[PDB]
Amino acid sequence: GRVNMSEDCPQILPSTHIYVPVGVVKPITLAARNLPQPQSGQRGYECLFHIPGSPARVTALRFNSSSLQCQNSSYSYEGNDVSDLPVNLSVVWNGNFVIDNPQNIQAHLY
């Protein structure tokens, strides 16, 4: 679990844009690198969506060191003012450990 090289860091890699319609049950598959196996007394993964209106906490599954997925859920924002809203997402495990997001990958709620 020692990181000495910058390329070996826990980070989320981008895919072609994350499209999310409001009020539709969807899974959100992610790719990444060197995702840790949670150890003794350590919980699993969650996706946290930073929507000013409503912030959603959805638990996820780490399939291997290189892929994640938040589970079937629907999302919304209260306004009807902007069609395309990009949202900061943070991928957490064991409650508060936020994985690094270099490209600052966002979820588009349309």
Partner 1 sequence: PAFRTFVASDWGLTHLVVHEQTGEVYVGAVNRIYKLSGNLTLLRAHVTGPVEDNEKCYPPPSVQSCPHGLGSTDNVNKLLLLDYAANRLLACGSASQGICQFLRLDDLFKLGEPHHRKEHYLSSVREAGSMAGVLIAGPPGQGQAKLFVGTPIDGKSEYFPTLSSRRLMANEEDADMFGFVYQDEFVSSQLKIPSDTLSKFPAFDIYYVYSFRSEQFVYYLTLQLDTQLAGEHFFTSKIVRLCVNDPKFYSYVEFPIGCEQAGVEYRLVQDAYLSRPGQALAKQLGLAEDEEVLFTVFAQGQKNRVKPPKESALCLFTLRAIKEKIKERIQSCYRGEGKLSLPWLLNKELGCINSPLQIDDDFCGQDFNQPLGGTVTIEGTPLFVDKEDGLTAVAAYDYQGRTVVFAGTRSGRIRKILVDLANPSGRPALAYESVVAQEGNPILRDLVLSPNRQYLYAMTEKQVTQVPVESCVQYTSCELCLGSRDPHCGWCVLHSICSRQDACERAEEPQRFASDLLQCVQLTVQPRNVSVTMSQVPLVLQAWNVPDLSAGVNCSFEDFTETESILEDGRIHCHSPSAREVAPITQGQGDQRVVKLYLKSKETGKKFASVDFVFYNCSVHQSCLACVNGSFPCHWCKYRHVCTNNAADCAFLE
Ligand X SMILES: *[C@@H]1O[C@H](CO)[C@@H](O[C@@H]2O[C@H](CO)[C@@H](O[C@@H]3O[C@H](CO[C@H]4O[C@H](CO)[C@@H](O)[C@H](O)[C@@H]4O)[C@@H](O)[C@H](O[C@H]4O[C@H](CO)[C@@H](O)[C@H](O)[C@@H]4O)[C@@H]3O)[C@H](O)[C@H]2NC(C)=O)[C@H](O)[C@H]1NC(C)=O
Ligand Y SMILES: *[C@@H]1O[C@H](CO)[C@@H](O[C@@H]2O[C@H](CO)[C@@H](O[C@@H]3O[C@H](CO)[C@@H](O)[C@H](O)[C@@H]3O)[C@H](O)[C@H]2NC(C)=O)[C@H](O)[C@H]1NC(C)=O
Ligand Z SMILES: *[C@@H]1O[C@H](CO)[C@@H](O)[C@H](O)[C@H]1NC(C)=O
Point out which residues bind ligand Z (CB under 6 A).
25, 27, 72
User: Rounded to the nearest whole angstrom, what is the least distance from the CB of residue 61 to partner 1 in the complex?
Assistant: 6
Tokens at 108, concatenated? 């588009």
Other C-beta atoms within 10 Å of 20: how many? 18
The HSE-up count of residue 91 (CA atoms within 13 Å, CB side) is 30
Q: Which does 71 bind (CB under 5 to 8 A by kind): ligand X, partner 1, ligand Y, none?
A: partner 1
Q: Which of 69, 22, 24 is nearest to 47 (CA)?
A: 69
Do 9 and 34 meet the contact criterion of CB atoms below 8 Å apart?
A: yes
Q: Should residue 74 be labelled a site residue for ligand Y when binding is judged by CB under 6 A?
A: no
* Contact of residue 40 among partner 1, ligand Z, ligand X, none (CB under 5-8 Å per partner type): partner 1
Q: Sketch the per residue contact string, 12 through 31, with partner 1: x for CB under 8 A, - otherwise.
A: --------------------
Give the number of other Cβ atoms within 10 Å of residue 54's Cβ.
Answer: 10
How far apart CA 7 and CA 71 sit, in angstroms, is 29
CB of 61 to ligand Z, least distance (A): 10
Closer CB to ligand Y, residue 21 or residue 52? Answer: 52
**Which residue is nearest to ligand Y, using beta carbons?**
88
Nearer to partner 1, 71 or 76 (CB): 71
